[PDB]
Amino acid sequence: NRSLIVTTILEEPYVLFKKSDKPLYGNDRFEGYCIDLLRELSTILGFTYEIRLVEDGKYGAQDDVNGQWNGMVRELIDHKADLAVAPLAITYVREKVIDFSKPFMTLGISILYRKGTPIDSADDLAKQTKIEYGAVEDGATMTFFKRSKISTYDKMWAFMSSRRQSVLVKSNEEGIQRVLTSDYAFLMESTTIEFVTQRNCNLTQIGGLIDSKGYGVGTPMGSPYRDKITIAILQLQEEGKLHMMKEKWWRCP
Amino acid sequence: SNRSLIVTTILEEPYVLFKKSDKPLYGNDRFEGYCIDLLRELSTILGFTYEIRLVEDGKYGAQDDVNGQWNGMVRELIDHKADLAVAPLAITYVREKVIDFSKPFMTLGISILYRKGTPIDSADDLAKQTKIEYGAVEDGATMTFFKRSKISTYDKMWAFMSSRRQSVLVKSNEEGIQRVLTSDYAFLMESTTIEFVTQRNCNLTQIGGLIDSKGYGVGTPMGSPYRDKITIAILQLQEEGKLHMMKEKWWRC
Ligand SMILES: N[C@@H](CCC(=O)O)C(=O)O
Ligand SMILES: N[C@@H](CCC(=O)O)C(=O)O
Ligand SMILES: [Cl-]
Ligand SMILES: [Cl-]
Ligand SMILES: [Cl-]
Ligand code: NA
Ligand code: NA
């Protein structure tokens, strides 16, 4: 009978606080693609839930000196949440410590920048320093760069790391703002870029996808919900409901 | 020494092919392709040996309406006649209920292969007419998608395909391509395979976009301990750029 605890994070258009003059409470506070997803999962699998924003405001990465995780990943490891329903990338290092459903969305890292310039790829950024570039701190993009042995991406990480106090940000919204107000390119997931460039006609994706990954629902390692949620996602996909949800939340001359 | 794993697969270019050789080849040495390269990488990461066997009935796998029984590679896993299926095997709702899959090594969707020079632009345009026949591989995921779909366009299409099945359902993608080339016929084909085919025959084209979204995964019997191990190995390979390199090698008008 117990309601599942669902950790999440604010990220447009996946999870947002509803706009209202009327003060809102509990789950009624939230809306977005991942909220619609959670509701559909709850009806298919027959559970109730309580949404809680991850307290540290992080997606999750491992501390390279003490070995501890943070963010939603740590919430799951510690059994403080039953599910993480968010744009949470399924990654090699995370799958070793938590479980994930199969993906509800597929994406890759790409670049958000202003229009009208000769920059066309990550290699173009890597070879210069006048245009600064960075990523969300303690997320999957940062971790990809931090771990990569690929020359272009390892050069980019050395720059990000050197300039971390300025170029690593706490949210995608902070990264967008840096693009809009300084000479800065943001390494951003492509699904989110698609949302942002439809609303900011002076911004564009630069190049293609650097990698390929999916977003999945996170569970603690060994949870029986993991496979059940995979099957429900696959149902939702085939019925057309994921595509409908994407259209709803994603909607220039 | 540990028992070698029996790996079921199916001939499908450029995933799995017999090598061209004037010299007679034996055993695993007979085969090449994207999935063969994937299998080799998995074997070194996970430390197993293996024996490749072509699925005996020549099918991917679907469930019989009357007797409830599966066929193809899905059935070989259900019956423990193979340890793994390493092939372009779509992860689907109905299959995940009876076998296990790794997370995807490639993402794709159903689309349409047809000859160039047509006003037909979508599945809707095909469904509304009958002069141009259309169909799919018998007993695979595309056929099953149409047979199960409650979406109007696709249910209309399935009624036509089912009526005409002895003529429009084929036993391989190869046979579907030949029907496109030798009659007034459009083939419902997975997008990654369309990409391969249209790069080598400049008379053919994709029509419309993707009708759905799915992944290819390594199949295992339900409950297999290899499932999650192979997911982790695939995520490592992705991270490192090796899946991308393999796709470029095998897909390189
Ligand atoms: N979605 C990412 C955060 C954003 C990013 O890293 O670009 C994650 O799951 O960590
Ligand atoms: N790859 C498909 C077969 C081809 C198709 O159905 O289009 C399967 O896993 O069934
Ligand atoms: Cl580049
Ligand atoms: Cl899985
Ligand atoms: Cl054309
Ligand atoms: Na895991
Ligand atoms: Na399964």
Are A240 and A187 in the same domain?
no
Residue B219 bridge partners (DSSP): B85, B101
Are B162 and B76 in the same domain?
no
Question: Which residues in chain A are closer than 8 Å to B213, comparing Cβ atoms?
Answer: 106, 237, 242-243
Angle (deg, nearest 10), helices A33-45 and A241-250: 160
Tokens of A68: 């501890």
Number of domains in chain B: 2
Return the CATH number at B46. Answer: 3.40.190.10
Q: How far is the CA of B192 from the centre of ligand 5 (A)?
A: 18
- Please choose, from the candidates B253, B114, B110, the residue with its C-alpha nearest in 3D space to the C-alpha of residue B180: B114
Tokens of B232: 């982790």
The C-alpha torsion from A21 through A24 and A27 to A32, rounded to 10°, is 10
Residue B203: what are its φ and ψ, rounded to 5°? -80, -10
Are A27 and A94 in the same domain?
yes
Resolution, angstroms, 1 dp: 1.3
Which of left, alpha, beta for A18 (phi over 0: left; psi -120 to 50: alpha)? Answer: beta
Are A73 and A124 in the same domain?
no
Cβ distance B213 to A240 less than 8 Å, yes or no, reads: no
Residue B170 bridge partners (DSSP): B137
Question: Which residues in chain B are closer than 8 Å to A102, comparing Cβ atoms?
Answer: 91, 96, 101, 103-104, 215
Q: Which long-range contacts does B119-123 make (Cβ < 8 Å, 24+ apart)?
A: B120/B186, B120/B207, B121/B207, B121/B208, B122/B207, B122/B208, B123/B153, B123/B154, B123/B157, B123/B208, B123/B211
Report the C-alpha gap between B133 and B179 in whole angstroms: 10
One-letter amino acid at B157 equals M
Q: Where are the beta strands (DSSP E) in B109-241?
A: 110-115, 133-135, 185-190, 204-207, 214-216, 219-221
Report the C-alpha gap between A33 and A31 in whole angstroms: 7
* B98–chain A Cβ distance below 8 A for any pair: no
Residue A89 bridge partners (DSSP): A215
Is the beta carbon of B142 within 6 A of some atom in ligand 2? Answer: yes
Tokens of B213: 């979204």
Give yes or no for a contact between A4 and A47, defined as CB atoms under 8 angstroms apart.
yes
Q: How far is the CA of A192 from the centre of ligand 7 (A)?
A: 30
Considering only CA atoms, which residue is closest to atom 4 of ligand 1?
A139
- Angle at Cα A204 formed by Cα A198 and Cα A206, nearest 5°? 140
- Per-residue CA distances from B79 to A199, B55, B215, B223 (Å): 52, 13, 23, 13
| DSSP reduced 3-state for A159 | helix
Are B199 and B231 in the same domain?
no
Give yes or no for a contact between A209 and A108, defined as CB atoms under 8 angstroms apart.
yes
Give yes or no for a contact between B85 and B73, defined as CB atoms under 8 angstroms apart.
yes
- Angle at Cα A97 formed by Cα B101 and Cα A216, nearest 5°? 50
> For residue A30, how many C-alpha atoms fall within 13 Å in the half-sphere facing its CB?
27
Cβ distance B96 to A231 less than 8 Å, yes or no, reads: yes
Which of left, alpha, beta for A247 (phi over 0: left; psi -120 to 50: alpha)? Answer: alpha
- According to the annotation, is A140 in a ligand binding site? yes
Are B4 and B104 in the same domain?
yes
Question: For the stretch A185-222, what's the b/e string if a residue is b when 16 or more beta carbons lie within 10 angstroms of its beta carbon?
Answer: bbbbbbbbbebbbeebeebbbbeebbbbbbbbbbbbee
Are B2 and B101 in the same domain?
yes
Report the C-alpha gap between A36 and A243 in whole angstroms: 12
Experimental determination approach used: X-ray
Question: For the stretch A126-165, what's the b/e string if a residue is b when 16 or more beta carbons lie within 10 angstroms of its beta carbon?
Answer: beeeeebbbbbbbbbbbbbbbbbebebbebbbebbeeeee
Are B100 and B34 in the same domain?
yes
Give yes or no for a contact between B82 and B6, defined as CB atoms under 8 angstroms apart.
yes
Angle (deg, nearest 10), helices B242-251 and B226-240: 80
Burial of A240 (0-12, 13-18, 19+ CB in 10 A): middle
Tokens of B32: 């090449």
Are B90 and B118 in the same domain?
no
Are B66 and B23 in the same domain?
yes
Question: Which residues in chain A are closer than 8 Å to B241, comparing Cβ atoms?
Answer: 150, 211
- According to the annotation, is A87 in a ligand binding site? yes
| Residue B49 belongs to domain spanning | 1-108+214-253
Which helix (H) or strand (E) element contains residue B127? helix B123-127
Are A103 and A217 in the same domain?
yes
Report the C-alpha gap between B170 and B206 in whole angstroms: 19
Are A143 and A219 in the same domain?
no
Report the C-alpha gap between B202 and B92 in whole angstroms: 31
